Write a protein that binds this ligand. Structure first.
Ligand SMILES: C[C@]12CC[C@@H]3c4ccc(O)cc4CC[C@H]3[C@@H]1CC[C@@H]2O
Ligand SMILES: C[C@]12CC[C@@H]3c4ccc(O)cc4CC[C@H]3[C@@H]1CC[C@@H]2O
Lengths: 284, 284
């Protein structure tokens, strides 16, 4: 009962943090369906849930594989309330390394999960929301979906894709009463994030010494930005709640304002020259 | 010999028009490899080539299926000059209709062709260009890759994806001497384009009467813009040549300036509200 919320990718990151934040809310007004690709990773969620003493029945875990429309439909049947008021499309994958070093299947997976996965969720849940004339969909964005970043080619491709998919739907949904918002996250404190970055030899034999040397420089710079600007998951997760509660929500919510100046010079020059130059000088 | 150019998707559209435009150039300085997914569609290309009296040996057709890395590699071996100076990533698919009415495989194909296909081409051809310290890659963009359009959700997703993939690479390639440019096309006179649009019943039984009614309104509006603003393929194809010849090319080349005001109000308001409102009022 209550405001039924369904979130994808709750085994860590803002997803897990958002589920427990909702389920543990003092008002006890949200019933939460935290979905995970592999249930064997539900431990963290439950330990975090017990840590915030979430009332029994405010949090339920479902196995949902966004790469499978059959998994998406089945999970939709498990929603006992037979209604979803807030859908949070959060599941996502990252990809780092020179374009030529990335395996084809890896590239195919990031699009499949990040973009198509979100398409599968919306196809399954959008119809009913339009029929009711109400619903809210929140999508986890990234400033990497607002500007291109070296060595994150395919990652930015998928995030830029969400921006376009969402802006299009938004124009159409305006009259149907269903709201759609993107939460533009900058870097969020994920120790695992700063540890995933770092690939010597394996990358070296699949690229050239000059691209490799550039990858190193990018990694060094990346570590700096993360350290000096990574936000608390609690700060980010709360933005999801600000959007979620806004009577007339905007299409975009920015969790931080530090990256806004770099985005402005990106439009003052539609030819992309200024940006490409500024970003290169700053990263190299 | 000469400036070797390889283009994808030459069975019609700007691709075909660009190949013959290059191969027939008075200076006879371009050797052209026009690739097609199905060779049985090479007729038009050849008839157009004969119409512009292209010298023998200035145009060669190769079957290249961008959805297959095996096809991409094989075609790369057919390049007798053993070098590619200008790669034009043009192959692409469109998709129209309410998100919920689009089949999953159709959505998967547009990303596979438009985005991954471009990834497969760059992985195969980027390395060599970096090793030489020179090369030019031109990618066919769309203003639908710069702003979201109702009923073109997945199409805009794929075009927004190219924008992100390219802006990222650009930042990295700046020092390697290889140039990458996007050609932002508005609508181009394609009779087939205005005839593809239009789907009653089939769409109706896979959506609701209100979305259907909106689809109709969008189609009506789409027909107007095309009629009042579609450009000649010769005008667009020439932009590809302006980029191709620029000593220091920019990241973006716009074939028309009419859509620039609508793009400006899109950044003056990063929350996306103004744009979503303006585009809805204009389209509905
Ligand atoms: C795209 C992200 C936000 C923007 C970050 C940024 C922003 C600007 C910059 O100069 C470098 C970086 C490196 C890490 C990036 C992040 C990686 C994941 C995160 O979502
Ligand atoms: C995205 C395209 C350019 C922009 C066009 C536009 C631009 C603005 C607008 O008000 C409506 C349309 C409808 C058709 C669109 C086109 C469909 C294909 C073309 O590339």
């Amino acid at each position: 009962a209550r405001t039924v919320v369904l979130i994808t990718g709750c085994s860590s990151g803002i997803g897990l943090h958002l589920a427990v934040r909702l389920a543990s809310d003092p008002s006890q007004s949200f019933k939460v369906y935290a979905t995970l690709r592999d249930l064997k990773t539900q431990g963290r969620l439950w330990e975090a849930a017990r840590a915030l003493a979430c009332p029994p029945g405010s949090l339920e875990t479902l196995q949902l594989d966004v790469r499978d429309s059959k998994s998406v439909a089945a999970a939709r049947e498990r929603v006992t309330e037979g209604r979803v008021d807030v859908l949070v499309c959060n599941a996502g994958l990252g990809l780092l390394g020179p374009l030529e070093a990335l395996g084809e299947d890896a590239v195919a997976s990031v699009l499949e999960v990040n973009v198509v996965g979100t398409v599968r969720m919306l196809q399954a849940f959008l119809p009913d929301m339009k029929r009711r004339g109400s619903g809210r969909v929140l999508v986890t964005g990234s400033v990497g979906g607002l500007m291109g970043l070296p060595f994150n080619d395919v990652y930015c491709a998928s995030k830029f894709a969400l921006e376009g998919l969402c802006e299009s739907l938004a124009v159409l949904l305006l009259p149907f009463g269903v709201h759609l918002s993107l939460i533009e996250c900058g870097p969020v404190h994920t120790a695992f994030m700063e540890k995933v970055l770092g690939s010597p030899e394996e990358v070296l034999d699949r690229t050239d010494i000059h691209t490799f040397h550039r990858f190193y420089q990018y990694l060094a710079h990346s570590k700096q930005v993360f350290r000096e600007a990574a936000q608390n998951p609690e700060e980010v997760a709360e933005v999801f709640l600000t959007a979620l509660r806004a009577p007339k929500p905007t299409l975009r919510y920015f969790t931080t304002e530090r990256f806004l100046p770099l985005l402005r010079m990106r439009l003052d020059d539609p030819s992309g020259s200024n940006y490409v130059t500024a970003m290169h000088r700053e990263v190299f």
